C-alpha cells in the first residue's frame, strides 16, 4: 500500500525570499476529484504537484504526488489551500520538517 516518510527541507535564501522548490495542490476548499495522485478521489489533502530540478525539495527527497500529512508539527490533512501555503512559508523557520506518504511503488 502507501508508505510514510519524513522529508526535511532547508529553505533557500534568495535575497529576501525563502524558496522550497516545489508546488502544492489540494485542500478542503478545493475539488478533490481533480487530483491524479490520490487513489481516493474524495481525498482533499495536500499533495506535491511539482518538484523543481536541483531545488531544495528535490535534493531533500520530496517526490511529485507525495501527500503532505504534517509540517513542523502542524497538521496538513484538514487544512485549506492557503493554510498549507502559510504553514510552508513561515519566514521564521529556515527548515520545514515534512511528514508525507507516497504510493510505495515496489508493489508489483
Amino acid at each position: 500500500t502507501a508508505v510514510v516518510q519524513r522529508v526535511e527541507i532547508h529553505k533557500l535564501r534568495q535575497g529576501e525570499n525563502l524558496i522550497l522548490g516545489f508546488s502544492i495542490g489540494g485542500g478542503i476548499d478545493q475539488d478533490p476529484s481533480q487530483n491524479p495522485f490520490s487513489e481516493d478521489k474524495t481525498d482533499k489533502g495536500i499533495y506535491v504537484t511539482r518538484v523543481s530540478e536541483g531545488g531544495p525539495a528535490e535534493i531533500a527527497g520530496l517526490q511529485i504526488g507525495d501527500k503532505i500529512m504534517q509540517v513542523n508539527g502542524w497538521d496538513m490533512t484538514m487544512v485549506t489551500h492557503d493554510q498549507a501555503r502559510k504553514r510552508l512559508t513561515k519566514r521564521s523557520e529556515e527548515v520545514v520538517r515534512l511528514l508525507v506518504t507516497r504510493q510505495s511503488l515496489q508493489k508489483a
Binding site: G21, T49, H81, A84
Partner: peptide
Amino acid sequence: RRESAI
C-alpha cells in the same frame, strides 16, 4: 485546481 509554488 489551484496551485502554489513555494
